[PDB]
Write an enzyme that holds these catalytic residues in place. Structure first.
Site, PDB file in Angstrom:
ATOM      1  CG  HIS I  19       7.467   3.622   1.299  1.00 14.13           C
ATOM      2  ND1 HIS I  19       6.672   4.473   2.038  1.00 14.13           N
ATOM      3  CD2 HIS I  19       8.673   3.610   1.912  1.00 14.13           C
ATOM      4  CE1 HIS I  19       7.363   4.934   3.066  1.00 14.13           C
ATOM      5  NE2 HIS I  19       8.582   4.426   3.011  1.00 14.13           N
TER       6      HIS I  19
HETATM    7  S1  FES Z   1       3.036   6.544   3.313  1.00 16.72           S
HETATM    8 FE1  FES Z   1       5.186   5.940   3.390  1.00 16.72          FE
HETATM    9  S2  FES Z   1       5.587   7.752   4.605  1.00 16.72           S
HETATM   10 FE2  FES Z   1       3.550   7.255   5.363  1.00 16.72          FE
END
Ligand code: FES
Ligand SMILES: CCCCCCCCCCCCCCCCCC(=O)OC[C@H](COP(=O)([O-])OCC(O)COP(=O)([O-])OC[C@@H](COC(=O)CCCCCCCCCCCCCCCCC)OC(=O)CCCCCCCCCCCCCCCCC)OC(=O)CCCCCCCCCCCCCCCCC
Ligand SMILES: CCCCCCCCCCCCCCCCCC(=O)OC[C@H](COP(=O)([O-])OCC(O)COP(=O)([O-])OC[C@@H](COC(=O)CCCCCCCCCCCCCCCCC)OC(=O)CCCCCCCCCCCCCCCCC)OC(=O)CCCCCCCCCCCCCCCCC
Ligand SMILES: COC1=C(OC)C(=O)C(C/C=C(\C)CC/C=C(\C)CC/C=C(\C)CC/C=C(\C)CC/C=C(\C)CC/C=C(\C)CC/C=C(\C)CC/C=C(\C)CC/C=C(\C)CCC=C(C)C)=C(C)C1=O
Ligand SMILES: CCCCCCCCCCCCCCCCCC(=O)OC[C@H](COP(=O)([O-])OCC[N+](C)(C)C)OC(=O)CCCCCCCCCCCCCCCCC
Ligand SMILES: CCCCCCCCCCCCCCCCCC(=O)OC[C@H](COP(=O)([O-])OCC[N+](C)(C)C)OC(=O)CCCCCCCCCCCCCCCCC
Ligand SMILES: CCCCCCCCCCCCCCCCCC(=O)OC[C@H](COP(=O)(O)OCCN)OC(=O)CCCCCCCCCCCCCCCCC
Ligand SMILES: CCCCCCCCCCCCCCCCCC(=O)OC[C@H](COP(=O)(O)OCCN)OC(=O)CCCCCCCCCCCCCCCCC
Ligand code: HEM
Ligand code: HEM
Ligand code: HEM
Lengths: 239, 56, 98, 74, 52, 65, 379, 32, 54, 54, 54, 51
Positions: I19
């Site tokens: 993300h």
């Molecule tokens: S994958 Fe987004 S928190 Fe590490």
């Protein structure tokens, strides 16, 4: 952000008193065994539950002994490997969660014993998910290893395309079209989440009928025994 | 009237009332279960394990 | 005029439908509990029959025919003097307590 | 509190009929339907308005939220 | 529970309530076989037996 | 082998809701691509297009399956 | 020599409580919920025992035990979903009961009203622990949030929170003590409900009209007993529809993921029947202010007999006040929906106004209005 | 007086069998 | 923690690649749906070789 | 009662459940015991009625 | 934890690694013994002084 | 309410203030003793030996 919700597909079991197509359950078990069981697990479902739902006793026994499941310490001091039987749960693909995370890109394939009762949307989600794979839109560059699925929250699922056309041969001979495979596996997963799905509905049917009978008569009893008060016809005669 | 004969026969005595209720439940459970299972298999035909057992 | 809104609220209240004249709907506190007791016999009996009629109608979920709906201009306040006397006596008692 | 120390009442005559000669459903629909319509008329204008304004508030919130989640020129 | 309860009136009262008590016991027996789904009775019965 | 999924996909993409959803899609894509260093994503237009296609597709497909 | 109904010392209370109890003649259906609560409690006792029949309140096996109930035990799914939906239906009837008490002026009965408030508190606590028991993601995370809310208390906040947790975080100790507390509390509710009935029986009951029905009382046995049975049958209808046609309709699916204290779920919404307070908790920016508002939202029922000023006991004859009460009900529904929704731009302000108006109706608007019709009706 | 009072007509609520003033309710008592 | 790094990535020490809210060398999220940065405990560096944490 | 073919998991769990519930039944029956005792009063060691010495 | 794989371990945990837990556990057991002592003495009192007349 | 205040109630209060206030003192001492409030027992001679 955004969360593309799964459209409501017209499943056969969607109906108020409609149970799953058990032949579709038989087909949907094979895809789980040959495709989904490679990385995922169904730890809460054993071969015993399979009998009478989509397989008979001898086929269940043969299917169970197809795989090898660990039994307790032998009389020598160590693990001894034995073929499975009826009372053995579906084999775990990975020894521990850490092995599962390491073997994959770093994610964890969730157990499907409840994935339809845990994901908001149910079967309509999973099916669409398995059929929602597409080229990422322009302006979006997922990291190597990540795959784009609009239905998945975050659109960055770490799942290789699990279902492609002609992935496995159904025993009965139905075509291996990706849509058919996904439909059957979703029905199977719904059954796995809700094994009572048939009987519950059956029970509900009876509850609909007799409570359609008890409710009037009991009401008919009430108005029977309460009519004395409802036809009182009082009178006042002061001097 | 049929209702009058019914009452004079097996409804006056509360104990005969209970006997009628019990023997009626004996057959009501059977009839209702048969009928409801019938309706359920008719609604879901070709999908239940019983309907598809003969293949294997 | 203000009488217009008074009459509108009287009609919207609904106790006129059941035949009750205002005082029949009083919440029975201690002062009221004495107020009914001090009532003369005829008024008390009329009130108790009137409340009986209302309870019957509410059990049946019905109302009187339009004609026998107690008029706003005919709502006699048979309890206001007795209740006011009880209140005045209670105020005097409290003042003596002070 | 049991029957007998409840009240004082006089000149009140109460008739009645046994449940075994009066029909338990006397003109059920014929008089029930006008009765239910009258009861609904009495209370609809004082029950519904808050619920409909709640409905408007709820729907308004739904879009306003998802518009806030939409894109924006830049 | 002694000679008091033994007498012609008590014997007659027994006779009076024997039909009622006996068919109350029949009620109890039918209820028991129904609730327990007692096969060893229900097999001999008509249509009911088709449940098994 | 021909999957009915692709067939239903196309005949449902012919719907006019999908037509204008696609219009906004190809309006978004070059707007983002030509802008060398923009931080916009066409995910919203793709989402509306997929919603319009999939609600329609759900009605069909299962009959063929 | 004397009727055993009114001769046997044990039969005395039962006869005077359910057989020959003088009840108002014009009691509406809104009073049937009084039975519907009690009967429902028994199912929660009856079902909840059988869940306790097959249940290991252990972090590593609680969820496995619940799944084994719903999947392996004979008709275990029936008992489990009957229990959960019965709890939800119990809260439905509790809210309807409180609404009836507010409407027809039953809070004049004081002792019963306060005892009912205590009943409400105990029932909500019981439901909280019950939702903690399955040890799903929502179970664990909602428990963590709600117990962390207690940290807002000054000075003794952290120590009290760690005390309730039984350790440093919601873990083995927390679940193990929550199960035993959930076992004991419903019996406290039962004894307190007996006290509730004892207090109520001394003042008869409040008929919908609000005037005393001492002169129109009727025997209880041939009457409402049958009507109460009919109400219980309707309640069974609703409950059975919920269980048999959509068991998880009133329940977040995320609970079916085993509780992992490493992943926060996208939403931490509690059960449907708590959001009305939870939303209030979200409204107040201050943590301590939030907790005080949350507790005061329920506590405000105690002040109700004091705030009443209309000389009429019941709401049957107060139109404007009726509009106010239905505004209050709409506010409660709005608060529930807001608690369901996340904390974003459109919802924050709506929650603020909903909380403010919900308090304003009870404290200010209702008594001030009650003055108005008294002035309107020449008294 | 006691003579003056009388039972109001209940003909709207009666069952079909017990509706005429010349028949006897004993005949239809068993039926009802 | 969607398939994250093990103290690596483009942004120095840590960085979330699934993300947005890319981590920092100290763990600060850049921009996205992460509620906060990498969780930080109540460390107690009262002496060397100790740094007591929770 | 066993819950299976021998005293096993189900027996232990159900025994815990019953052992939890039952003492409240004991409490209820004890309350009824006292209720019944009060209607006659306690019996003194002498056995004879002590209504003149209560 | 009423499970046959942790019941004994849980009891040992109560007795050993719980703040004043051994006191509670042994209070329970010896209280059961004393409860039955008192019950037997109560039944004996009822038998002796003819309290079964109630 | 207006039933309160006035002449009689104020000397009633004056009569009962010592008792109520020192009952509150009883409660404060009982609370600090039961809860072992280290803060307060820091300033009492004997009971500093606890900690
Ligand atoms: S994958 Fe987004 S928190 Fe590490
Ligand atoms: C959620 C939790 C569960 C909630 C439900 C359970 C608790 C409440 C239980 C209430 C109860 O037992 O009786 C209430 C209430 C008590 O009044 P009643 O016995 O109906 O008598 C009529 C009233 O006096 C009112 O009479 P009326 O003036 O309306 O006219 C006569 C009659 C006729 O009117 C009608 O029948 C309405 C027309 C449509 C039918 O009215 C009714 O029957 C009203 C009820 C609705 C039908 O009874 C019902 O609501 C009947 C049950 C529902 C209908 C039958 C279903 C089978
Ligand atoms: C057409 C749309 C529905 C009817 C119109 C409803 C409306 O706008 O005002 C209700 C309209 C005016 O209220 P009302 O007649 O003065 O209410 C008298 C009692 O307070 C409340 O009624 P009640 O206690 O005299 O009679 C029981 C009544 C109402 O029963 C209940 O309200 C409790 C049970 C239903 C579930 C609780 C949530 C509603 O039951 C029914 O009407 C149908 C059966 C409901 C389930 C079994 C009981 O009444 C009716 O239409 C019947 C009662 C309310 C039905 C809802
Ligand atoms: C018009 O008033 C009334 C009713 O219905 C509107 C009623 O139904 C009843 C009767 C109610 C009940 C029997 C159920 C509710 C009572 C309780 C929960 C008190 C505890 C007693 C029980 C027998 C139930 C619990 C038993 C066991 C655990 C009462 C008293 C009543 O007052
Ligand atoms: C004692 C009355 C009969 C109970 C009984 O076993 O009924 C038969 C039914 C059904 O079983 P059944 O019809 O096979 O009869 C009993 C057979 N044996 C003795 C081998 C178990 O019993 C039950 O359902 C439960 C038995 C216990 C009931 C108390
Ligand atoms: C488990 C179940 C069993 C539990 C143990 C059972 C056996 C022990 C019971 C207690 C001992 C007997 C009673 C002792 C108390 C007593 O004397 O009560 C009567 C006494 C009265 O006895 P009295 O009447 O002789 O003295 C008072 C009268 N004047 C003032 C005139 C002298 O009660 C009180 O004094 C009440 C007020 C003071 C006590 C309460 C507060 C004290 C501080 C508490 C701690 C801080 C908070
Ligand atoms: C939807 C919620 C309401 C369902 C029932 C419909 C309804 O409210 O009907 C109106 C009814 C009128 O009650 P009544 O006392 O006859 O009013 C006299 C007015 N002059 O209203 C009532 O009977 C009021 C009942 C109030 C308590 C139950 C409903 C609120 C529950 C909140 C939780
Ligand atoms: C205690 C041991 C001493 C004892 O009991 O001595 C006997 C004494 C007699 O007391 P009393 O009845 O006043 O004597 C009348 C004499 N004409 O005292 C008594 O008899 C009083 C005690 C009577 C029995 C009380 C019940 C407990 C008995 C011992 C446990 C029995 C358990 C098994 C039976 C149940
Ligand atoms: C006051 C009435 C009660 C209420 C409102 C209540 C509420 C609840 C709720 C909401 C749950 C969660 C169910 C789920 O999420 O699936 C639950 C679980 C549970 N309750 Fe209760 N309960 C009550 C009474 C009881 C009683 C008396 C017992 C014990 C005899 C009990 C034992 C349990 C157990 C063991 C669970 C865990 C299994 C499960 O999740 O269903 N409950 N309760
Ligand atoms: C444990 C749940 C509860 C049970 C089992 C219970 C039981 C009952 C019963 C059976 C009645 C008589 C029927 C009726 O009037 O509705 C009643 C009346 C009443 N209850 Fe409750 N109650 C509960 C919760 C509450 C709550 C939460 C309140 C409000 C704080 C409350 C306050 C009252 C009042 C005021 C009455 C009198 C209503 C009237 O007669 O007009 N109770 N209760
Ligand atoms: C659950 C345990 C029991 C409790 C809590 C209990 C409670 C009580 C209490 C407090 C008394 C009054 C004090 C006394 O006279 O001893 C009493 C009296 C009595 N109890 Fe019990 N009891 C229990 C068990 C029993 C048993 C097992 C019996 C015999 C079957 C019994 C029979 C009696 C009798 C006969 C009396 C009257 C004694 C007299 O009149 O002198 N109780 N019970």
């Amino acid at each position: 952000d955004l969360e593309l919700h799964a459209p409501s597909y017209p499943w056969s079991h969607r109906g108020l008193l409609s149970s799953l197509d058990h032949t579709s359950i038989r087909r949907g078990f094979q895809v789980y065994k040959q495709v989904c069981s490679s990385c995922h697990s169904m730890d809460y479902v054993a071969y015993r539950h399979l009998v009478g739902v989509c397989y008979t006793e001898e086929e269940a026994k043969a299917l169970a002994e197809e795989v090898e499941v660990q039994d307790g310490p032998n009389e020598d001091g160590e693990m001894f490997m034995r073929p499975g039987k009826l009372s053995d749960y579906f084999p775990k693909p990975y020894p521990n969660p850490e092995a599962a995370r390491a073997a994959n890109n770093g994610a964890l394939p969730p157990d499907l014993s409840y994935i339809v009762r845990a994901r908001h949307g149910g079967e309509d989600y999973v099916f669409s998910l398995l059929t929602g794979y597409c080229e990422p839109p322009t302006g979006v560059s997922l990291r190597e290893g990540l795959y784009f699925n609009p239905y998945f929250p975050g659109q960055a699922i770490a799942m290789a395309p699990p279902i492609y056309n002609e992935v496995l041969e159904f025993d009965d001979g139905t075509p291996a079209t990706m849509s058919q495979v996904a439909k059957d596996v979703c029905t199977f997963l719904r059954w796995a989440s809700e094994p009572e799905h048939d009987h519950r509905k059956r029970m509900g049917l009876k509850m609909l009928m007799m409570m359609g009978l008890l409710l009037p008569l009991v009401y008919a009893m009430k108005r029977h025994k309460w009519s004395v008060l409802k036809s009182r016809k009082l009178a006042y005669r002061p001097p | 009237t049929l209702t009058a004969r019914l009452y004079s026969l097996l409804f006056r005595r509360t104990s005969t009332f209970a006997l009628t209720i019990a023997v009626g439940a004996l057959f009501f459970e059977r009839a209702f279960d048969q009928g409801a299972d019938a309706i359920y298999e008719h609604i879901n035909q070709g999908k239940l394990w019983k309907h598809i057992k003969h293949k294997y | 005029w203000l009488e217009g809104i008074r009459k509108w609220y009287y009609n919207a209240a609904g106790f006129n439908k059941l035949g009750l004249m205002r005082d029949d709907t009083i919440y029975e506190d201690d002062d009221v509990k004495e107020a009914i007791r001090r009532l003369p016999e005829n008024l008390y009996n009329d009130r108790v029959f009137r409340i009986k009629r209302a309870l019957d109608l509410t059990m049946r979920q019905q109302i009187l025919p339009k004609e026998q709906w107690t008029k706003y201009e005919e709502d006699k306040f048979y309890l206001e003097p007795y209740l006011k006397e009880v209140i005045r006596e209670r105020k005097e008692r409290e003042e003596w307590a002070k | 509190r049991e029957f007998g120390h409840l009240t004082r009442m006089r000149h009140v005559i109460t008739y009645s009929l046994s449940p075994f000669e009066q029909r338990a459903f006397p003109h059920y629909f014929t008089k029930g339907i006008p009765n239910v319509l009258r009861r609904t008329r009495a209370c609809i204008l004082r029950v519904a308005p808050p619920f409909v304004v709640f409905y408007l508030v709820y729907t308004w919130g739904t879009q306003e939220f998802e518009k806030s989640k939409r894109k924006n020129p830049a | 529970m002694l000679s008091r309860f033994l007498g012609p009136r008590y014997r007659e009262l027994a006779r009076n309530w024997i039909p009622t008590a006996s068919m109350w016991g029949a009620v109890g027996a039918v209820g028991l076989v129904w609730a327990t789904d007692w096969r060893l009775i229900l097999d001999w019965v008509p249509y009911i037996n088709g449940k098994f | 082998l021909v999957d009915p999924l692709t067939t239903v996909r196309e005949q449902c993409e012919q719907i006019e809701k999908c037509i204008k959803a696609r219009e906004r899609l190809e309006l978004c894509d070059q707007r983002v691509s030509s802008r060398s260093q923009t931080e916009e994503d066409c995910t919203e237009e793709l989402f509306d297009f997929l919603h319009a296609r999939d609600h329609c597709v759900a009605h069909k497909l299962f009959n063929s399956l | 020599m004397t009727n055993i109904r009114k001769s046997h010392p044990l039969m005395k209370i039962i006869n005077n409580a359910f057989i020959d109890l003088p009840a108002p003649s014009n009691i509406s259906s809104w009073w049937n919920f009084g039975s519907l609560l009690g009967i429902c409690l028994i199912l929660q006792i009856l079902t909840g025992l059988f869940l306790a029949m097959h249940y290991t309140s252990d972090t590593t096996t609680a969820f496995s035990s619940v799944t084994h109930i719903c999947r392996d035990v004979n008709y275990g799914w029936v008992i489990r979903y009957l229990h959960a939906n019965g709890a939800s239906m119990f809260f439905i009837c509790l809210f309807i009961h409180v609404g009836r008490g507010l409407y027809y002026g039953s809070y004049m009965f004081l002792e019963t009203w306060n005892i009912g408030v205590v009943l409400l508190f105990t029932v909500m606590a019981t439901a909280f622990m019950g939702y903690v028991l399955p040890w799903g993601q929502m179970s664990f995370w909602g428990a963590t949030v709600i117990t962390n809310l207690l940290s807002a208390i000054p000075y003794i906040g952290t120590d009290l929170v760690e005390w309730i947790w039984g350790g440093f975080s919601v873990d083995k100790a927390t679940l193990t003590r929550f199960f035993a507390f959930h076992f004991i509390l419903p019996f406290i509710i039962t004894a307190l409900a007996a006290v509730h009935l004892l207090f109520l029986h001394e003042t008869g009951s409040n008929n919908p009209t609000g005037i005393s029905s001492d002169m129109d009382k009727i025997p209880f046995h041939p009457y409402y007993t049958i009507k109460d049975i009919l109400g219980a049958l309707f309640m069974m209808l609703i409950l059975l529809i919920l269980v048999l046609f959509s068991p998880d309709l009133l329940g977040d699916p995320d609970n079916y993921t085993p509780a992992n204290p490493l992943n926060t779920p996208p939403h931490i919404k509690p059960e449907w029947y708590f959001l009305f307070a939870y939303a209030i908790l979200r409204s107040i920016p201050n943590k301590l202010g939030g907790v005080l508002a949350l507790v005061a939202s329920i506590l405000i029922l105690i002040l109700m007999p004091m705030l009443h000023t209309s000389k009429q006991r019941s709401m049957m004859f107060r139109p404007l006040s009726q509009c106010l009460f239905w505004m209050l009900v709409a506010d409660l529904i709005t608060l529930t929906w807001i608690g369901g929704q996340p904390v974003e731009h459109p919802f924050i302000i709506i929650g603020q106004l909903a909380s403010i108006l919900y308090f304003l109706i009870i404290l200010v608007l209702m008594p001030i209005t009650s003055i108005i019709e008294n002035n309107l009706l020449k008294w | 007086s006691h003579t003056d009072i009388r039972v109001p007509d209940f003909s709207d609520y009666r069952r079909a069998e017990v509706l005429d003033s010349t028949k006897s309710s004993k005949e239809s008592s068993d039926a009802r | 923690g969607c398939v994250p790094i093990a103290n690596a990535g483009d942004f120095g020490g840590y960085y979330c690649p699934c993300h947005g809210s890319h981590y920092d060398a100290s763990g600060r999220i850049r921009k996205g749906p992460a509620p906060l940065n990498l969780e930080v405990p109540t460390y107690e560096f009262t002496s060397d070789d100790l740094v007591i944490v929770g």
